[PDB]
Design a protein around this ligand. Sequence first.
Ligand SMILES: C[C@@H]1CCCCN1C(=O)c1cnccn1
Ligand SMILES: C[C@@H]1CCCCN1C(=O)c1cnccn1
Lengths: 264, 263
Amino acid sequence: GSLTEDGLSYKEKFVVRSYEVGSNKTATVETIANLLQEVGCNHAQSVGFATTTTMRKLHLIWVTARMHIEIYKYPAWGDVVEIETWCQSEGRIGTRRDWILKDSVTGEVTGRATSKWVMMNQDTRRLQKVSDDVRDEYLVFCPQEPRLAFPEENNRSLKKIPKLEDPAQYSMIGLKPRRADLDMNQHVNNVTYIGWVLESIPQEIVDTHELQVITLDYRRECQQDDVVDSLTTTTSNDSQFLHLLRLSGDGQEINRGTTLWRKK
Amino acid sequence: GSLTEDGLSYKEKFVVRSYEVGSNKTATVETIANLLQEVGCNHAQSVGFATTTTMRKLHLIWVTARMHIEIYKYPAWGDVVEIETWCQSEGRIGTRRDWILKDSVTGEVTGRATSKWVMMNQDTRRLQKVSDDVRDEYLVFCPQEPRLAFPEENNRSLKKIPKLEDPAQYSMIGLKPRRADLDMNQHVNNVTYIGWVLESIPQEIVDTHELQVITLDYRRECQQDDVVDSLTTTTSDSQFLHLLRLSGDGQEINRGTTLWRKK
Ligand SMILES: C[C@@H]1CCCCN1C(=O)c1cnccn1
Ligand SMILES: C[C@@H]1CCCCN1C(=O)c1cnccn1
């Protein structure tokens, strides 16, 4: 992996490993998300980092508020995927990270992703607008003119997701994180929520369709000892679903989202 | 990755990715096992496969009966691990696959593993013992003189594991496989059982110790709709006896032992 010539984006090639392919005989949505995270971490490392020394001082961290992924073609075991990632400031609202996924052999775009990140105090969990000092620290590593993975004036990455109404059409109850679902900082990995949302999609859809689009809003972190319920209702050749992740007990919302699936 | 000069073993280098590192700030036992599987798959592919066309006709598959892993040093995020793997016939009993893990920079052995594989009919689930026809087709890819990752005459990898007696000292109940725990053939992958066994190790041990040895016996496959209980009792460095069983009838799926060293 390496930063591109202008030092304003990073590119890396990844082989799809055997343990990364699912029932569909190709990489899963979760494998794609894992690869997006890995290329994002390597980009931040290549420029001396997520947190600047000013953020560490004030106990501030970047947290994902929204993730939007669209896949046109899933790579098979042994295929090489080339991913280009970059960051951009969004004024005082937060930061955005975008990705372009390509087939290494054909050079064609096989997927694209975008994510909204907000600033939060690590301890109190209180969100805050980006200060001017923090803004200038990461602006030197970002393109100045807007560069969007989803440029379109009325695309699907900026749609507001409604809250699922009870009764849900489908559900998967009592989902618990395992010790493997935790990262280096003992927190539940953002990829785990993608898996949990897909747990309540009916088996028939999983067997005959491929996920084309996924939009996921993050509302609350799930602790190691929390239990989650995954809820899904069809909202629609193509199937659409509205999703809701909530705590098994009090029903406190942790995530909401939408998925769009295409017939194999 | 590539086969070595004699074509009797395969070597590959792997970078440890960010999503592969755990609470310990290093690769997990599950990440190591995933890397062993990947290098094993690439070795079978490099020689045209690990079912031969004769096994395919008769509906026979190789199944793991025992897995034994020993880790001396866990790689950190971004570290490159070099793994060498090879196979060997064990008469009519089955096959063995061994691995040697090395640090790419220092060349030192950071871990080693061994596994016993038995022949089974994928439909009836019946053990069948290895035929003579299926032997001459895989012996051409195996070293002829014995080559053992664990050579020591009666060491840790060949110790019989006893069955845990109730009440268990520790337990983690209601463990269900997710759709991500299934492989390309819709089966629960063998790495998932390693995770489930480690779920009942006390948090105190996990936070202050590193796993040094793991021996896991496979008795029954867990289906997508099965629920499992993970049981652990200290038998002692800390040693544990483990048992995975179905949440309902208590039907055994796995038994094992772990040895942990203070960080
Ligand atoms: C059906 C699989 C199995 C795991 C659960 C969901 N899946 C995916 O993430 C996927 C993979 N490829 C295409 C579309 N979706
Ligand atoms: C404690 C971690 C966290 C995940 C569950 C078990 N662990 C390991 O697999 C491990 C064990 N020893 C050293 C490094 N990692």
